[PDB]
């Protein structure tokens, strides 16, 4: 849990405590970055105001949906272990896969 909205469930808060304690321990009661945590989010719906506010943070880095060129290159490395004779198809697959992560 994290985002308690105007009102959330009782349940969100009960679990929310486990995150709060870890976050704190690592940063802003200290100046160190030797012990660090990187947080990944995948659901926008529940995201803590506590984290947002710095000193449990300083940067927000968007990890984008793969690019126009980026999908082409993933396809080439993934194809390589599998037996093939060489395909030219990797360009066709990128179009169809427009917006696939």
């Amino acid at each position: 849990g994290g985002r308690r909205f105007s009102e959330g469930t009782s349940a969100d808060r009960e679990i929310q405590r486990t995150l709060m304690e870890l976050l704190n321990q690592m940063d802003g009661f200290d100046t160190l970055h030797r012990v660090k945590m990187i947080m990944a989010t995948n659901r926008p719906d529940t995201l803590d105001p506590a984290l947002l506010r710095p000193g449990r943070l300083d940067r927000k880095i968007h990890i984008d949906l793969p690019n126009e060129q980026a999908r082409l290159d993933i396809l080439k490395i993934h194809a390589g272990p599998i037996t093939k004779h060489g395909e030219i198809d990797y360009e066709a697959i990128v179009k169809l896969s427009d917006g696939f992560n």
Binding site: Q25, L52, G55
Partner: protein
């Protein structure tokens, strides 16, 4: 026998397996704001007597609202 009131605290709770290490010198700005908070929180704890001599009720809590970060 008796124990201190300190004993048998939760470790579930924050700030009894952490402590802050910061001070006023360590940050720069909001010097004006720092003096107000300090006046309200720090002085009555350290000194109960100063507030009594003057005759006012020791300082009440401070509500902190503002920009993120």
């Amino acid at each position: 026998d008796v124990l201190p009131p300190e004993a048998d605290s939760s470790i579930m709770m924050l700030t009894s397996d952490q402590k802050p290490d910061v001070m006023y010198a360590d940050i720069g700005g909001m010097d004006i704001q720092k003096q107000e908070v300090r006046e309200a929180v720090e002085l009555p704890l350290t000194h109960f007597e100063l507030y009594k001599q003057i005759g006012i009720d020791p300082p009440r809590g401070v509500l902190m609202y503002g920009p993120p970060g």
